[PDB]
Design an enzyme around this catalytic site. Sequence first.
Site, PDB file in Angstrom:
ATOM      1  N   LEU A  97      -5.259   1.155  -2.024  1.00  0.00           N
ATOM      2  CA  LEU A  97      -5.184   1.624  -3.428  1.00  0.00           C
ATOM      3  C   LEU A  97      -6.385   2.542  -3.574  1.00  0.00           C
ATOM      4  O   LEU A  97      -7.483   2.063  -3.302  1.00  0.00           O
ATOM      5  CB  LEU A  97      -5.171   0.418  -4.346  1.00  0.00           C
ATOM      6  CG  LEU A  97      -3.942   0.020  -5.145  1.00  0.00           C
ATOM      7  CD1 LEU A  97      -2.630   0.439  -4.527  1.00  0.00           C
ATOM      8  CD2 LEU A  97      -3.999  -1.514  -5.301  1.00  0.00           C
ATOM      9  N   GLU A 114      -7.196  -4.075 -14.304  1.00  0.00           N
ATOM     10  CA  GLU A 114      -5.852  -3.611 -13.921  1.00  0.00           C
ATOM     11  C   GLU A 114      -5.189  -4.757 -13.146  1.00  0.00           C
ATOM     12  O   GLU A 114      -4.061  -5.144 -13.530  1.00  0.00           O
ATOM     13  CB  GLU A 114      -5.858  -2.287 -13.181  1.00  0.00           C
ATOM     14  CG  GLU A 114      -4.635  -1.368 -13.281  1.00  0.00           C
ATOM     15  CD  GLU A 114      -3.356  -1.965 -12.731  1.00  0.00           C
ATOM     16  OE1 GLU A 114      -3.265  -2.297 -11.556  1.00  0.00           O
ATOM     17  OE2 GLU A 114      -2.402  -2.104 -13.519  1.00  0.00           O
TER      18      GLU A 114
HETATM   19  N1  LIG Z   1       0.133   1.912  -6.872  1.00  0.00           N
HETATM   20  C1  LIG Z   1       0.806   0.743  -6.798  1.00  0.00           C
HETATM   21  O1  LIG Z   1       1.067   0.150  -7.784  1.00  0.00           O
HETATM   22  C2  LIG Z   1       1.207   0.204  -5.467  1.00  0.00           C
HETATM   23  C3  LIG Z   1       1.912  -1.155  -5.314  1.00  0.00           C
HETATM   24  C4  LIG Z   1       2.166  -1.493  -3.875  1.00  0.00           C
HETATM   25  C5  LIG Z   1       1.802  -0.707  -2.874  1.00  0.00           C
HETATM   26  N2  LIG Z   1       1.124   0.499  -3.106  1.00  0.00           N
HETATM   27  C6  LIG Z   1       0.726   1.381  -1.931  1.00  0.00           C
HETATM   28  O2  LIG Z   1       1.952   1.958  -1.324  1.00  0.00           O
HETATM   29  C7  LIG Z   1       1.552   2.335   0.058  1.00  0.00           C
HETATM   30  C8  LIG Z   1       2.356   1.481   1.047  1.00  0.00           C
HETATM   31  O3  LIG Z   1       3.555   2.207   0.962  1.00  0.00           O
HETATM   32  P1  LIG Z   1       4.842   1.986   1.903  1.00  0.00           P
HETATM   33  O4  LIG Z   1       5.879   2.875   1.477  1.00  0.00           O
HETATM   34  O5  LIG Z   1       4.431   2.209   3.273  1.00  0.00           O
HETATM   35  O6  LIG Z   1       5.068   0.443   1.800  1.00  0.00           O
HETATM   36  P2  LIG Z   1       5.908  -0.805   1.430  1.00  0.00           P
HETATM   37  O7  LIG Z   1       7.218  -0.556   0.853  1.00  0.00           O
HETATM   38  O8  LIG Z   1       4.950  -1.856   1.017  1.00  0.00           O
HETATM   39  O9  LIG Z   1       6.162  -1.211   3.066  1.00  0.00           O
HETATM   40  C9  LIG Z   1       7.279  -0.399   3.675  1.00  0.00           C
HETATM   41  C10 LIG Z   1       7.872  -1.428   4.671  1.00  0.00           C
HETATM   42  O10 LIG Z   1       8.559  -2.284   4.052  1.00  0.00           O
HETATM   43  C11 LIG Z   1       9.884  -2.459   4.576  1.00  0.00           C
HETATM   44  N3  LIG Z   1      10.878  -1.970   3.659  1.00  0.00           N
HETATM   45  C12 LIG Z   1      10.628  -1.431   2.451  1.00  0.00           C
HETATM   46  N4  LIG Z   1      11.722  -1.098   1.797  1.00  0.00           N
HETATM   47  C13 LIG Z   1      12.709  -1.548   2.746  1.00  0.00           C
HETATM   48  C14 LIG Z   1      14.269  -1.525   2.740  1.00  0.00           C
HETATM   49  N5  LIG Z   1      14.831  -1.011   1.631  1.00  0.00           N
HETATM   50  N6  LIG Z   1      14.873  -1.950   3.782  1.00  0.00           N
HETATM   51  C15 LIG Z   1      14.106  -2.414   4.769  1.00  0.00           C
HETATM   52  N7  LIG Z   1      12.801  -2.507   4.926  1.00  0.00           N
HETATM   53  C16 LIG Z   1      12.164  -2.029   3.837  1.00  0.00           C
HETATM   54  C17 LIG Z   1       9.831  -1.799   5.958  1.00  0.00           C
HETATM   55  O11 LIG Z   1       9.314  -2.809   6.746  1.00  0.00           O
HETATM   56  P3  LIG Z   1       9.443  -3.360   8.373  1.00  0.00           P
HETATM   57  O12 LIG Z   1       8.709  -2.351   9.131  1.00  0.00           O
HETATM   58  O13 LIG Z   1       8.897  -4.708   8.175  1.00  0.00           O
HETATM   59  O14 LIG Z   1      10.895  -3.398   8.657  1.00  0.00           O
HETATM   60  C18 LIG Z   1       8.921  -0.608   5.606  1.00  0.00           C
HETATM   61  O15 LIG Z   1       7.962  -0.199   6.682  1.00  0.00           O
HETATM   62  C19 LIG Z   1       0.020   2.107   0.157  1.00  0.00           C
HETATM   63  O16 LIG Z   1      -0.666   3.220  -0.508  1.00  0.00           O
HETATM   64  C20 LIG Z   1      -0.053   0.809  -0.763  1.00  0.00           C
HETATM   65  O17 LIG Z   1      -1.348   0.732  -1.192  1.00  0.00           O
HETATM   66  C21 LIG Z   1       0.832   0.948  -4.410  1.00  0.00           C
HETATM   67  C1  LIG Z   2      -2.351  -3.980  -2.973  1.00  0.00           C
HETATM   68  N1  LIG Z   2      -1.679  -4.588  -4.126  1.00  0.00           N
HETATM   69  C2  LIG Z   2      -0.530  -3.947  -4.724  1.00  0.00           C
HETATM   70  C3  LIG Z   2      -0.661  -3.694  -6.213  1.00  0.00           C
HETATM   71  C4  LIG Z   2      -1.897  -3.589  -6.808  1.00  0.00           C
HETATM   72  N2  LIG Z   2      -2.046  -3.319  -8.114  1.00  0.00           N
HETATM   73  C5  LIG Z   2      -0.934  -3.172  -8.810  1.00  0.00           C
HETATM   74  N3  LIG Z   2      -1.021  -2.911 -10.132  1.00  0.00           N
HETATM   75  C6  LIG Z   2       0.111  -2.760 -10.895  1.00  0.00           C
HETATM   76  N4  LIG Z   2      -0.031  -2.543 -12.153  1.00  0.00           N
HETATM   77  N5  LIG Z   2       1.358  -2.827 -10.370  1.00  0.00           N
HETATM   78  C7  LIG Z   2       1.472  -3.074  -9.075  1.00  0.00           C
HETATM   79  N6  LIG Z   2       2.666  -3.160  -8.552  1.00  0.00           N
HETATM   80  C8  LIG Z   2       0.323  -3.271  -8.211  1.00  0.00           C
HETATM   81  N7  LIG Z   2       0.457  -3.527  -6.902  1.00  0.00           N
HETATM   82  C9  LIG Z   2      -2.136  -5.796  -4.578  1.00  0.00           C
HETATM   83  C10 LIG Z   2      -3.425  -6.212  -4.215  1.00  0.00           C
HETATM   84  C11 LIG Z   2      -3.936  -7.403  -4.659  1.00  0.00           C
HETATM   85  C12 LIG Z   2      -3.180  -8.251  -5.472  1.00  0.00           C
HETATM   86  C13 LIG Z   2      -3.729  -9.524  -5.940  1.00  0.00           C
HETATM   87  O1  LIG Z   2      -4.633 -10.080  -5.291  1.00  0.00           O
HETATM   88  N8  LIG Z   2      -3.315 -10.040  -7.088  1.00  0.00           N
HETATM   89  C14 LIG Z   2      -3.902 -11.273  -7.650  1.00  0.00           C
HETATM   90  C15 LIG Z   2      -4.977 -11.031  -8.658  1.00  0.00           C
HETATM   91  C16 LIG Z   2      -6.344 -11.478  -8.330  1.00  0.00           C
HETATM   92  C17 LIG Z   2      -7.375 -11.219  -9.336  1.00  0.00           C
HETATM   93  O2  LIG Z   2      -7.288 -11.362 -10.676  1.00  0.00           O
HETATM   94  O3  LIG Z   2      -8.595 -10.789  -9.036  1.00  0.00           O
HETATM   95  C18 LIG Z   2      -2.723 -12.041  -8.203  1.00  0.00           C
HETATM   96  O4  LIG Z   2      -2.778 -13.251  -8.105  1.00  0.00           O
HETATM   97  O5  LIG Z   2      -1.797 -11.421  -8.690  1.00  0.00           O
HETATM   98  C19 LIG Z   2      -1.910  -7.838  -5.828  1.00  0.00           C
HETATM   99  C20 LIG Z   2      -1.374  -6.640  -5.378  1.00  0.00           C
END
Ligand SMILES: NC(=O)c1ccc[n+]([C@@H]2O[C@H](COP(=O)([O-])OP(=O)(O)OC[C@H]3O[C@@H](n4cnc5c(N)ncnc54)[C@H](OP(=O)(O)O)[C@@H]3O)[C@@H](O)[C@H]2O)c1
Ligand SMILES: CN(Cc1cnc2nc(N)nc(N)c2n1)c1ccc(C(=O)N[C@@H](CCC(=O)O)C(=O)O)cc1
Length: 206
Positions: free
Chosen positions: A25, A32
């Site tokens: 992230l 958040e």
């Molecule tokens: N900003 C946010 O709120 C937020 C929340 C979560 C994550 N993120 C970020 O998103 C990024 C990770 O992105 P990502 O696209 O690589 O990850 P992701 O969806 O967490 O992981 C992708 C993996 O999940 C599986 N997968 C996902 N959708 C699938 C489907 N429809 N069918 C089968 N397998 C599926 C595959 O796994 P296998 O290889 O296991 O088959 C694919 O490699 C990082 O920047 C992470 O920090 C941000």
């Molecule tokens: C990397 N990641 C994905 C993530 C992070 N922030 C988000 N924020 C929002 N708003 N939505 C999301 N989907 C989201 N996803 C994370 C990372 C840590 C935890 C986590 O530890 N969550 C604790 C919170 C711990 C705490 O309060 O410090 C929990 O129990 O939910 C969740 C998601």
Amino acid sequence: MNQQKSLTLIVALTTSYGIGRSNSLPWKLKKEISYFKRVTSFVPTFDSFESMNVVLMGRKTWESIPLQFRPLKGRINVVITRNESLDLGNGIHSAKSLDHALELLYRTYGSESSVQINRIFVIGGAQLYKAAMDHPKLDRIMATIIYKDIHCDVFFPLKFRDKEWSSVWKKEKHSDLESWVGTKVPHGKINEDGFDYEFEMWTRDL
Ligand SMILES: NC(=O)c1ccc[n+]([C@@H]2O[C@H](COP(=O)([O-])OP(=O)(O)OC[C@H]3O[C@@H](n4cnc5c(N)ncnc54)[C@H](OP(=O)(O)O)[C@@H]3O)[C@@H](O)[C@H]2O)c1
Ligand SMILES: CN(Cc1cnc2nc(N)nc(N)c2n1)c1ccc(C(=O)N[C@@H](CCC(=O)O)C(=O)O)cc1
């Protein structure tokens, strides 16, 4: 059978739709992350007896979550993964897709079950957001907008807040936000570790 409930997506994105950078992230927001917890753990008291919500995530997101905080406590956790030979989990499900994840749950958490689901959340990542966004049961977006244009290499797949989707995505009033996540939520901007962000709730008709 496959789709009874509506899907809810929860994301935090910059104004330029960036959600990640270096499989991490680009930011560190204690408030958040607490809103995160709050929103996805919350279940009405009276129902707090029987129910749990669901956190559906893709493999990479699962691997990113501090190992000390995995599995997400209090919520049914499900990892979406194709290459699932040996998932690791003590009652933490795996499913090869969102639809398979939905029938798994609908088959495990049945009237037999002492545990019943309340709400279902897609929490990430980019890849699962992309499948969720196309799912015919997805009708709500729980979004946190960050007013900094940080460098990201992962973007959110549909520009839901742009004029082009304005007849489909509608931004609900804050009073409506709080009604759904069942609690008073900060209104307007919150500033943390130099970041300015805001909580919004977007709905769509199906
Ligand atoms: N900003 C946010 O709120 C937020 C929340 C979560 C994550 N993120 C970020 O998103 C990024 C990770 O992105 P990502 O696209 O690589 O990850 P992701 O969806 O967490 O992981 C992708 C993996 O999940 C599986 N997968 C996902 N959708 C699938 C489907 N429809 N069918 C089968 N397998 C599926 C595959 O796994 P296998 O290889 O296991 O088959 C694919 O490699 C990082 O920047 C992470 O920090 C941000
Ligand atoms: C990397 N990641 C994905 C993530 C992070 N922030 C988000 N924020 C929002 N708003 N939505 C999301 N989907 C989201 N996803 C994370 C990372 C840590 C935890 C986590 O530890 N969550 C604790 C919170 C711990 C705490 O309060 O410090 C929990 O129990 O939910 C969740 C998601």
